[PDB]
Structure 1
Amino acid sequence: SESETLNPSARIMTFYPTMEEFRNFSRYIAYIESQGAHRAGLAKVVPPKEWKPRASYDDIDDLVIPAPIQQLVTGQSGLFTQYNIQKKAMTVREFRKIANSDKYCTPRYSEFEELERKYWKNLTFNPPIYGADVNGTLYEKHVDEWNIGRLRTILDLVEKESGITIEGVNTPYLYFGMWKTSFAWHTEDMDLYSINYLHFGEPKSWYSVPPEHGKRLERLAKGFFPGSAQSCEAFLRHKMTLISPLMLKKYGIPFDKVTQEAGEFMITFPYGYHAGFNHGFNCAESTNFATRRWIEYGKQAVLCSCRKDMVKISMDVFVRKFQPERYKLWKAGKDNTVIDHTLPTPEAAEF
């Protein structure tokens, strides 16, 4: 098929839009899907050199991180579970001082591959603190291109129709990283897209599994964490499960890796599992968004059943507006639509 022939290896693509292509966010997402980018589950977008979301970051030392998290990781042989210990609130200044202190700072290395090895060898030692899930934005108010606080996708129909805001989902979160802080394997809530911008600092490294092969990763995880799988139908949404690339290779789980540098965007795609770690002191901004293609994913998303993860978006408004011919069938539990993960979103048609 046409869609199966684009990005058949499902490798992470990188894009360098001109400023004109960059100005319309939804349109460029459809463009990159027209090139097959979504099949990897993760794409890099390098914005125009001339583009900046903020003039400088010297004025945020006193910004409050209300709920920094000490990440205690337990496990062996490439399989781990991360436990969160909430610490007292601290300022960015205080967090940076700890991040760069001898106790916590990035180790010496040459090739990225050496640091990656250090991460997987040491992630259960000297537990770091992640300044995670901070409500806010570092964008200056007048930036209209790729502004994470107002992307103007159809996800906006949630708030527009019901008034409902979901922090970190249709509002932005900031993430202040230090060396060895991690994000465990997950797809987004409701299997949405996400956008992730690295404002400043040391890199953030990513792993991704193609959406068309996500079930393979799920089978592995349920097998190796049989307890969790008994207790929750979607325990990866707890964002506690870490799995090394050597473990993925040993069991034939397809994946790709990429390192995100300061001033680059990463896009995750519906049902794209991703995980990664920070190289050192840094700050990223993230939120979710949608396209028309997402609607079927939202209908079919398998949600956390154990109440640990509470985020649930009502799909009824999307099905009525965009799938009127299937609405009554869907309400009756008889909509057997199957997702073809290779297809690009319909807005991509013009390309």
Structure 2
Amino acid sequence: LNPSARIMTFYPTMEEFRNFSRYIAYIESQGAHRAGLAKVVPPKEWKPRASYDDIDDLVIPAPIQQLVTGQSGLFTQYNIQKKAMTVREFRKIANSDKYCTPRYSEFEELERKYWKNLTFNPPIYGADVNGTLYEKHVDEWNIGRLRTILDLVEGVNTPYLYFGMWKTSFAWHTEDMDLYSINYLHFGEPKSWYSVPPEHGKRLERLAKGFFPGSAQSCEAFLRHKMTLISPLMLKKYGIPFDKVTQEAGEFMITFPYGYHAGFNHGFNCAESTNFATRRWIEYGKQAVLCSCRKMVKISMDVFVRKFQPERYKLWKAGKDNTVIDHTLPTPEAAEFL
């Protein structure tokens, strides 16, 4: 299933869309996890909120001005924490002549403009806002309450809001503890994504180590600082397999364990995201290479190994667990579909 490891798009019916965890097992049975990123288009009848016309006075406690330094496909992004602003003030800045999306025909024209201007006119990203835009009664794919195996930890299971503007970006990274992630684009302009399949993740890390040797000597997982931007042209020049996709409003993006992703916002928008787990993540959690310099998001794997791997719990707590992770295998929950 999915030998090419290309990004897959799913269109579930209302019946299929009801159980979130069973649907993740279904897209895995179809090999969507091989790409590292999958798109889920929900049924037209499904809506997480009736109106977004009441969030003008919602506070963005720490907007970040993104300063990008670099040349010829390789860039470093630096954040400047600005003081608290409202969605109203942010939308006014996002839509102004200084920060607005340039005029474009197709995505490729906008993508070229992005890679050519990302170091000029630093944009502001309304990133990591603690909160949700889902209404109380919404039981399907409610990012603020997914009901996955990650809940046995209890701030990794909490939703975050991302208010974008043109040219705001997210650097090459995997999820904390190499977890899964769900991203819902509530409204606004698209969000473009790049992904490297989990089976090629080490090729990207080796490439990144070669470009930033000082950053690699100072940190075992320097890509976890989320500061490294690498263009598709640079990835193509050094033979890194990758795929790209554009997420539009009302669509979900799913990231899979050890699936490296990056991207940018086309203009003013709002995305809600959280992390989640399946039985397959457990092995990735145990084997995760964490940021050594900063003291970073770390989950104690003991509770997970004792509940879902009881037979191997003593061998692992000894330090003799030599399990090699096969990235192509779907989650055990996918058995019913196979």
TM range (shorter): over 0.9
The 4+ residue runs of structure 1 with deviation greater than 2 A are: none
2:303 is the counterpart of 1:323: no
1:35 maps to 30
The Cα of 1:307 is off from its aligned counterpart by 1.2
**Structure 1 position 350 matched with structure 2 position 336:** yes
Q: Equivalents in 2 of 1:79, 1:168: separation in Å?
A: 32
CA deviation after TM superposition for structure 1 residue 169, in Å: 2.0
Change (3 A) 1:183 1:156: same
How far apart, in 1, do the equivalents of 2:249 and 2:76 lie? 28
TM-score (norm 1): 0.95
Displacement of 1:198 in angstroms is: 0.2
Shift in Å, 1:168: 6.0
State whether residues 232 and 305 of structure 1, in contact with CA within 8 Å, keep that contact through their aligned partners in structure 2: yes
Root mean square deviation of aligned Cα: 0.9
Alpha-carbon distance between aligned partners in 2 of 1:45 and 1:82, rounded to the nearest angstrom:
29
Task: Write the distance in 2 (CA, Å) between the matches of 1:213 and 1:21.
Answer: 31
User: Cα offset for 1:298?
Assistant: 0.2
Contact 1:194 1:287 in 2 (8 A): yes
Question: What is the CA deviation profile of residues 114-164 of structure 1, one whole-angstrom value per residue up to 9, with x for unaligned ones?
Answer: 000000000000000000000000000110000001000000011xxxxxx
Give CA deviations for 1:281-313 in whole Å, capped at 9, x if unaligned: 0000000000000000000000000016x1000
Query: How many residues are aligned here?
Result: 337
Distance 2:16 2:128 in 1: 30
Using the TM superposition, name which of 324-333 and 128-137 deviates more.
Answer: 324-333
User: What stretches of structure 1 of length at least 5 have no aligned partner?
Assistant: 1-5, 159-166
1:177 pairs with one of 134, 140, 164: 164
Q: Distance in 1 between matches of 2:262 and 2:328?
A: 21
CA-CA distance at 1:95 after TM superposition: 0.1
Secondary structure at 1:138 match in 2: coil
How many angstroms does 1:35 deviate by?
0.3
In the alignment, what sits opposite 1:299? 286
SS in structure 2 of the partner of residue 32 of structure 1: helix
For residue 180 of structure 2, what is the aligned residue in structure 1?
193
Q: Distance in 1 between matches of 2:171 and 2:304?
A: 29
CA contact (8 A) 1:53 1:143 kept: yes
CA distance in 2, matches of 1:333, 1:76: 43
Aligned to 2:320: 334
Counterpart-to-counterpart distance in 1, 2:172 and 2:155 = 17
Maintained 8 Å contact 1:174/1:285: yes
Q: CA deviation at 1:332?
A: 1.0
Cα 1:35–1:232, aligned 2, differ >3 Å: closer, same or farther?
same
CA contact (8 A) 1:206 1:275 kept: yes
Q: What secondary structure is seen at the aligned counterpart in 2 of 1:83? A: strand
Task: Tell me, yes or no, if the aligned pair for 1:71 and 1:82 is still in contact at 8 Å.
Answer: yes
Which digits, 9 at most, give the CA deviation of each residue in 1:237-291, with x for residues without a partner? Answer: 0000000000000000000000000000000000000000000000000000000
1:106 aligns with 2:92: no
Structure 1: distance between partners of 2:213 and 2:13: 48
